[PDB]
Design a binder for this molecule. Sequence first.
Ligand SMILES: Nc1ncnc2c1ncn2[C@@H]1O[C@H](COP(=O)(O)OP(=O)(O)OP(=O)(O)O)[C@@H](O)[C@H]1O
Ligand SMILES: Nc1ncnc2c1ncn2[C@@H]1O[C@H](COP(=O)(O)OP(=O)(O)OP(=O)(O)O)[C@@H](O)[C@H]1O
Ligand SMILES: [Mg+2]
Ligand SMILES: [Mg+2]
Lengths: 285, 401, 49, 372
Amino acid sequence: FVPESDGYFHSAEHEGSINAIMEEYRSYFPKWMCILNEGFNILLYGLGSKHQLLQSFHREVLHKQTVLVVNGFFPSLTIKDMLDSITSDILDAGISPANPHEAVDMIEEEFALIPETHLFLIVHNLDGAMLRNVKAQAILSRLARIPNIHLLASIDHINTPLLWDQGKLCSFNFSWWDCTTMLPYTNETAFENSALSSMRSVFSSLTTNSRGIYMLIVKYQLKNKGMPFRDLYSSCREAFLVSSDLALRAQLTEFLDHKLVKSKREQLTIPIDGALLQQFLEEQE
Amino acid sequence: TPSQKMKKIRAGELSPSMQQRTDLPAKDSSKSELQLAREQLHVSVVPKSLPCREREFENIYAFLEGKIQDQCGGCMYVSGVPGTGKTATVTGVIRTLQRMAKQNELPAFEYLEINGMRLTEPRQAYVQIYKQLTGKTVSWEQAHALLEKRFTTPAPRRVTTVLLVDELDILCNRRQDVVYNLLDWPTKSAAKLVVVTIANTMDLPERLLMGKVTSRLGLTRLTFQPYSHKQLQEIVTARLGGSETFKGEAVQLVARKVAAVSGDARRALDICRRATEIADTAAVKCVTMLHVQQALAEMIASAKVQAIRNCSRMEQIFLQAIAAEVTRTGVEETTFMGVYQQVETIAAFMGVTFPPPGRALRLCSKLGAERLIISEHSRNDLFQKILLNVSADDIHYALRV
Amino acid sequence: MDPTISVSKGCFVYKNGATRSLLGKEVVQQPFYEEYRKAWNQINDHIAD
Amino acid sequence: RNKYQNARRVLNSAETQNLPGRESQLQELREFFSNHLESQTSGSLYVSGQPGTGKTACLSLLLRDPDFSKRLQRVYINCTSIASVGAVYKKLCTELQLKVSGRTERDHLEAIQRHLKTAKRMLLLVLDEIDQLCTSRQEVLYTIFEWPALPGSRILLVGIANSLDLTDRALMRLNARCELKPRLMHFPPYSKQQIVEIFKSRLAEAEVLDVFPPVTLQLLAAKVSAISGDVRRALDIGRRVVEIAEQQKRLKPVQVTQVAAVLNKVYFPLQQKLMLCTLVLMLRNERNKDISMGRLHEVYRRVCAKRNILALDQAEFTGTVDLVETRGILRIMRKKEPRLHKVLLQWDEEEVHAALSDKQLIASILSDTACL
DNA sequence: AGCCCCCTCACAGACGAGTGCCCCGCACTTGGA
DNA sequence: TCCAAGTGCGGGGCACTCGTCTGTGAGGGGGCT
Ligand SMILES: Nc1ncnc2c1ncn2[C@@H]1O[C@H](COP(=O)(O)OP(=O)(O)OP(=O)(O)O)[C@@H](O)[C@H]1O
Ligand SMILES: Nc1ncnc2c1ncn2[C@@H]1O[C@H](COP(=O)(O)OP(=O)(O)OP(=O)(O)O)[C@@H](O)[C@H]1O
Ligand SMILES: [Mg+2]
Ligand SMILES: [Mg+2]
């Protein structure tokens, strides 16, 4: 694969073959144990989802050793959680310090004392949501350097080695394996990292004065094709919809919090078109 | 020793005493009539019945007597600008109810009081209420757990406990759990809590409280309007009594000048004491119009023209040049460079030579410490910003005349 | 989807007797592992020297 | 004693037994609990509604039934009484009489997770005001709402809240699993006839029906159910009418005029008048709405110099504007130095003209535009 | 006949108050010695 | 008579958070040789 520069400047049998691919990838596991014994780490860079392959390697091979599975595709994990887990849940030595490099020095000092206690860790999506900074990769490269800690990891993004320098690439003693499955990304995309009906549903929950205020805003929006606060205030005080200014301001605050009115300093624009708003207006006749 | 002193202070077993005077305090016979009018005009001396606060007194008294004789609990919100007889009327109502409950005219009750502006955090309210229940100081989580065990569970015979909450707006934080817990316990049937909250702003339930808190707070509000010209004369003429020390026009001018600014009663009761202290030094026994006008000039003071008259020569040249630079370049926020250029022009006009900018920065710092101008740190010399804090006509009134 | 993947935890501990060679007797007694270890120790000591 | 104090005592806005308005929502909750007790499966539930509509009343009427008390173990937890968001697990142990080693929240969480798998009775957990458990990453709410998906568990939980879209904004990840999505239930606001039926239950419970004719109750309900819709304000105004009529008249039943006066009730110094006059003048005769305190003071000084009125200093003018701020006419945006504070008028000019009631003065200031 | 030069507008950054949270010291202290 | 280490709790460092504020990169709009 050699990319060209010009494009930048001018701008069933499938299941049986997938199970055959998975069995041919499951034939690699004692070779992976012999590679992991000699100081290397394992990196997978295929196309499909490699969650089931690492789960099968954990189940069928490492069913007795210490294992720290790290879901790197989780959108709200931290380095403090992983380091506190290694400090307090494996070593039973209290919470790790708040500065993470001192925690890595602590983990190195407590792992130097205990040989033949091999800790495995299986990072699904080493380039995940909260692992894309350089500090997390520096901490992971300091953790993978220890002769007891062994590392398996997955890679999914295309710009992943842009944040590994030669120090982080000589610390990570990687062995690049091509485990290209064809399974879809069903676990990595279900998290938080990846209208009219809501308007009708919220509008069916408001009271009658909120209905009158929102219909006044809708009528002004469909007449002038954003309204200031004083015109809405006079149009609501003429029809006895509000008592004072703070009642209308609380109604508009509830409108901003339920995402039906957009206020910009104080003009009030409903972020929809005229056709859906016209059919919404004739829906209440 | 620390240990037994802390264990006897936290348990509430030693009296928190204060030292006594060696010389015994003075007598009432040794005080003159001007001294008697000076001690009777103090803000600390609350009368046994408040003039011009009768309608609100009957309102709070009817509300609290109904809530005590019904044994049901509830909530009230009174509000008003500071100095208009809120806390005095509420504690007068509570003293009247306690005297009625002593004579077996009313069912008995307990009276708890907290103030939000003497608490370090709002959760210490839980430490204080419990301290008015038992006497023992605990942590706030244990006091909150014990208050929730006390109020939510039924235990006859439970006595009604009226809780007064002064300065409610300090108990409001980002989470608003303390005010929610205080306004939530009357809504239970086993807790006979009648909470009356006092605040300054009239729109406190709509401005910063959440929806459930302003729903629980109720709609039986009360507003203390400020004192007018006529009531603020009646207050002082009821304070002074039948003495002829204050003339009528003196009290009339004091009430007219105070009731046109704010409507505070503390302002009038301090201006009258200052007028008494002025008339003490003139070797007279009556307070005429002149001492009242002098006290009105001294208490309501405006000394940003005398401060410009009492500056040095180069600081007056500096103020003239800041005013001229504001006049020239239109916008008020000036830079020190154009100010120093107009300084050099004005100093070339008047003939006196000006110091270099190493001393003009000292002049600008001296005017900024005196708050005649508003200037930055002097670390960015010749590029610091200057606002004129005094009015541009005050300089022309202070230097021409 | 799986009971291993959750919506709260990010890390999962499988600690088995942790306190404070991966291959067993099958591979170490085989001759190719001993000759590989001997040759690698020789070459590593030579490059270190 | 008499019937006025009896109506005042029986309205009282506190916990009841008979709920005449919630007749279908209670049946829906009972059908949910029966279908989750019969087949012995776990499930979440999220009830939401405006403050004052009857969520805690329904879920406290259900938590005192004897058949559910003998079939399941129920726990009620209010989420505003806890110390912090991460401490609620400890409170669960206090509500379950568990045995933890203590002094850390993770051991409390593991003790709850051990108790949920080996329980002998089905656990119902009611979390009231669950919007106090919302945080930045929300590990506690996602941990709590995941326990139905735990293997071998039997916990079913009900979260009470005011926000309609709390579980769609702050609980998005639970949409990714069809087992873990909590079933919704929105308590609608009360109409007019439901508030009338609530009043007809509360008054005829203690035989105090004679003080309220239906006309005043119809007018009161037609105003309250239109303005806000909650029943706390309805009962509070219905108590305030009697509390006003007892002091006014002293049997005499209330008329339409008294309830109309109560509903239209619930729904100046010289220098402050001059400050409001110069602010209305500066907002009329100038386009941009940024008015500082120094510019307002400099206009007010010329206005006082033309009227031969002794003007105030800036240090007293700031206190005067801060005292007009308490009425609600203004709002002060705060800056570093007190000359720079921004004064925002938050009324209409006709409301200021009606509130001042000094027409010969306020018409003379707004025509005197020479000071600006 | 696709290209050359301004407009402008919500991200980028800062920043600044400001406010809540979590680690950390530290006396309590107590059942035990 | 004392005491070792849990522990309960206050206090400060820190990190988020809401609002303000200002450059600005590239999509967009008006003219071009
Ligand atoms: N109507 C009155 N009659 C007699 N004295 C009064 C009257 N009103 C106020 N005072 C005096 O002025 C003082 C006002 O105290 P008050 O209880 O009104 O403070 P407050 O309004 O609670 O203050 P804040 O609003 O700042 O909390 C009292 O000490 C009282 O002596
Ligand atoms: N259908 C009804 N019939 C009679 N009384 C009712 C009814 N619904 C509610 N109430 C009364 O309203 C009062 C408050 O209702 P409740 O506390 O259930 O509202 P809530 O939803 O819990 O409010 P929040 O959301 O603010 O906590 C109760 O004391 C109850 O007596
Ligand atoms: Mg007070
Ligand atoms: Mg409730």
